[PDB]
Design a protein around this nucleic acid. Structure first.
Ligand code: ZN
Lengths: 81, 216, 63, 97, 128
RNA sequence: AAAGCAUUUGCCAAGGACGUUUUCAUUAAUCAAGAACGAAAGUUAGGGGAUCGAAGAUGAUCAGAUACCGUCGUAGUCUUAACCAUAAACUAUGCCGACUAGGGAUCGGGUGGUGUUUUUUUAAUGACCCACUCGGCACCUUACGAGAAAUCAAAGUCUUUGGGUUCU
């Protein structure tokens, strides 16, 4: 206070700030690589997805939309890429 | 110049077999005279007695039963279930501030043709580590709670008569049955069925009343 | 004449607009456990006996 | 000048609250205003609790209570002394006694 | 338990007190005496002293016909009126106990609406 | 949006906030003229039967009482159909935008927790707890600042006087 480094705020403060209130705004969402139990193909899923995403094969369910992050269904291994 | 007290009898009020203390009390009726009977001046009476007096336990000191006189035989008069009500002591004591009052009612008839309206009441509660001081329920919880209560109150009456309904309003079966169906929606303390009401009655059918009586 | 006696246990305090009425608590001196609160006209000290023409009113303070 | 920042009692964000009636006079006063007390009393007084113990069937069962919420006008509550005037500094204190 | 039960319906308004005994059903009243028949002063009709004198005369009548024990239901005027029981309600209830009757299952039965019809005074009140 | 709106249940359209690595790309702000919506309260033609008081009927009180108090009662917040649109229509504080201070609560959404509880053994949600955040109705303490003061986190950033715009 009254002397601060406004060019280099600590990473904790930037992490606890809102998405648009950082020094440079940017998304807090990410993309996920999920493995449905049925087949073994690569499916990329948005973390805050709004559509009920299904695989190209056997098209069951991969996530259900929510008002926040998409709820990934019962057990399907997920990576974050 | 008449002294009308020394012209009346005394009749012994008798409760149905669904209760255990079947001796309620005594009442007065005038004598039977020319085209004026004592039975027709007696067949309409409704007696209000605390349910703790019929069962003897003090766990039921806050409920009451209307008993409608239906038939008179041998200087005792036989009653039938006319309605359950809930005393003004406890209903006005459950409604504290800083909570949500949830009420439901359904109009539904039994397997025999007794059309009834059943009233239920339930309150929210702070849950065992709560710091905030009011514990209100969102108004989508309250609508979902009423849907379960009305669903239970309907199904439970379809498969019973007042011979069986009055046997299940005593041991608080309904209250626990509401609770374990609505404990995953909101904590919901103090569930009661506070009032049932008789809407319509069928023909008299003396045999059902006599089968209900006739012991002791 | 159903005259019942009593004796003052504690003098509560004066009452009335002019303050000429003293409020006292009395023990019935036939049954000790009964204590009624009434108000007297003259001067009362502690532990003196009274006479009650009828012991039912349990009167409150006057204004 | 303005006397309280609440202007009275708590509306602050509504525009309109439906009124109630005083219990002494029945003046129509809004529900956000209209001083409220809750009178919880035993049905038998403190002098008759001893009296109705021996005259009771159902020994030591209970005593039921009278529950009654009272709404008061501003004028009637000052007159009935449930509320009295207080100093300019003491007016800001929102605590029960 | 050879007690015989009646029901004393006590109505304590601020103008008068009613002490009224029926049987278990509300028909066939045993004895009804008001606060106003024990004093012709027209302002002591609601006094506690005139209320308890009524209960002295009820229990005398209940002793003659043979009612020994009593359920009591006490009420105010109610409705859109005060909902507060009058000053005579306590004195008459205590006087039944001292008179020798038995008491059980007390309940306050004051009529209370579910927010119904308009009240005395017209928006500015009974103003004095 | 305001006037306003509180127990059900189903229909019919609407809406803010939040989330979003969606889409368009200046489409915006305030607005003469012109419009929509408006507490109540009597323009105006079924029904249902008064608790209130104009007045009126009346009974008191009073010097008088045409008032307050008491009893009753027609027009008079219930039709289906308009007010021309008036209120202490009030936060007596136009609307949009930016900045300046510390706190603890709460409503709605969201994020996180090798948290609690509900039972199937924990699980899944729900309810709760802790921390953060966006957006609200507010509040508490101060006064760098303002004010004639009362007081005000805006009524501050104002003789060191200019962010935009409407009305008086
Ligand atoms: Zn698949």
């Amino acid at each position: 206070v009254l002397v601060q480094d406004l060019l280099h705020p600590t990473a904790a403060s930037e992490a606890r700030k809102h998405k648009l209130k950082t020094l440079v705004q940017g998304p807090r969402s990410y993309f996920l690589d999920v493995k449905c139990p049925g087949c073994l193909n690569i499916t990329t899923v948005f973390s805050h997805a709004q559509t009920a995403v299904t695989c190209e094969s056997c098209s069951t369910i991969l996530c259900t939309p929510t008002g926040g992050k998409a709820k990934l269904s019962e057990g399907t291994s997920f990576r974050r890429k | 110049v008449v002294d009308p007290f020394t012209r009346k009898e005394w009749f012994d009020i008798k409760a149905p077999s669904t209760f255990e203390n079947r001796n309620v009390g005594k009442t007065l009726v005038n004598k039977s005279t020319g085209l004026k009977s004592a039975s027709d001046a007696l067949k309409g009476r409704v007696v209000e007695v605390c349910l703790a007096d019929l069962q003897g336990s003090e766990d039921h000191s806050f409920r009451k039963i209307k008993l409608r006189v239906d038939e008179v035989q041998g200087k005792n008069l036989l009653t039938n279930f006319h309605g359950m009500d809930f005393t003004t002591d406890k209903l006005r004591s459950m409604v504290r501030k800083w909570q949500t009052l949830i009420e439901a009612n359904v109009t539904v008839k039994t397997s025999d043709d007794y059309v009834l309206r059943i009233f239920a009441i339930a309150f929210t509660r702070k849950q065992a580590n709560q710091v905030k001081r009011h514990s209100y329920a969102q108004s989508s919880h309250i609508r979902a709670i009423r849907k379960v209560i009305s669903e239970i109150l309907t199904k439970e009456v379809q498969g019973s008569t007042l011979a069986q309904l009055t046997s299940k309003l005593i041991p608080e079966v309904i209250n626990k049955e509401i609770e374990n169906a609505t404990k995953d929606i909101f904590p919901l303390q103090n569930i009661h069925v506070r009032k049932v009401k008789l809407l319509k009655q069928p023909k008299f059918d003396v045999g059902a009343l006599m089968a209900l009586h006739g012991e002791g | 004449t159903p005259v019942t006696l009593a004796k003052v246990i504690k003098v509560l305090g004066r009452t009335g607009s002019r303050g000429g009425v003293t409020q006292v608590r009395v023990e019935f001196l036939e049954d000790t456990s009964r204590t009624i609160v009434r108000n007297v006209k003259g001067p009362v000290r502690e532990n003196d006996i009274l006479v009650l023409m009828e012991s039912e009113r349990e009167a409150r303070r006057l204004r | 000048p303005k006397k309280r920042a609440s202007n009275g009692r708590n509306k602050k964000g509504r525009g309109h609250v439906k009124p109630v009636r005083c219990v002494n006079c029945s003046k129509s006063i809004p529900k956000d205003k209209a001083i409220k007390r809750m009178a919880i009393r035993n049905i038998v007084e403190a002098a008759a609790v001893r009296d109705l113990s021996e005259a009771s069937v159902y020994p030591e069962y209970a005593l039921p209570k009278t529950y009654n919420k009272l709404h008061y006008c501003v004028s009637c509550a000052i007159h009935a002394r449930i509320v009295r005037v207080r100093s300019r500094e003491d007016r800001k204190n929102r605590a029960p006694p | 338990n050879s007690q015989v039960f009646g029901v004393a319906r006590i109505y304590a308004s601020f103008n008068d007190t009613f002490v009224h005994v029926t049987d278990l059903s509300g028909k066939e009243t045993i004895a009804r005496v008001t606060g106003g028949m024990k004093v012709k002063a027209d302002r002591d009709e609601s006094s506690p002293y005139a209320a308890m004198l009524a209960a002295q005369d009820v229990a005398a009548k209940c002793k003659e016909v043979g009612i020994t024990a009593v359920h009591v239901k006490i009420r105010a005027t109610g409705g859109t009126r005060t909902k507060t029981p009058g000053p005579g309600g306590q004195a008459a209830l205590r006087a039944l106990a001292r008179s020798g009757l038995r008491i059980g299952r007390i309940e306050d039965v004051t009529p209370v609406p579910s927010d119904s019809t308009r009240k005395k005074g017209g928006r500015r009140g009974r103003r004095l």
